[PDB]
Design a binder for this molecule. Structure first.
Ligand code: 6OT
Length: 167
């Protein structure tokens, strides 16, 4: 049994809710929240900008030190950093950004990072300002992630379309 409440069950392991991932993280304090990161861990906008704002920029300060030591992530890659006030850990995952022309096949590699964690609160990778079709992102999630994933979707319109169209 876990703390997550109000989710619709899509599969054995994937759950979805119309929610504010920031507000959901603040309530649950999950072991892992996933960030929709870029390779530079520059948390300017989208989910990353919202998560970072909720940490009062501490996520960005930590991320800048990580990049100064390790250099950029790979598209499809990830790193584990602090969850600050939101979670124990933040798994920063880089999905392909279609608005940069990145290979959408890298979306499966991105989701494979989730399998290193038993339970996660996450957004749909490559959705929103990363330009991918969120319906496609949810299909790749269900077909790739084997651990227990709680997906948060703020836009009620998109949430309803994802549920109604789910095979
Ligand atoms: N992707 S997100 O969680 O940052 C998000 C999306 C919308 Cl449409 C509104 C808010 Cl307040 C937050």
């Amino acid at each position: 049994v876990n703390s997550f409440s109000g989710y619709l069950k899509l599969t054995d392991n994937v759950y979805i809710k119309n929610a504010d991932i920031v507000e959901e993280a603040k309530k649950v304090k999950p072991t892992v929240v996933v960030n929709a990161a870029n390779v530079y861990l520059k948390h300017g906008g989208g989910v990353a900008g919202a998560l970072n704002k909720a940490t009062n920029n501490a996520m960005q300060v930590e991320s800048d030190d990580y990049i100064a030591t390790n250099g950029p992530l790979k598209v499809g890659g990830s790193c584990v950093l602090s969850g600050h006030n939101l979670a124990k850990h933040c798994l920063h995952v880089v999905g392909p950004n279609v608005n940069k022309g990145e290979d959408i096949q890298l979306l499966k590699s991105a989701y494979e990072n989730f399998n290193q964690h038993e339970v996660l609160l996450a957004p749909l990778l490559s959705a929103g300002i990363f330009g991918a079709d969120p319906i496609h992102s949810l299909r790749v999630c269900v077909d790739t992630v084997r651990t227990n994933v709680y997906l948060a979707v703020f836009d009620k319109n998109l949430y309803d379309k994802l549920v109604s169209s789910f095979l």
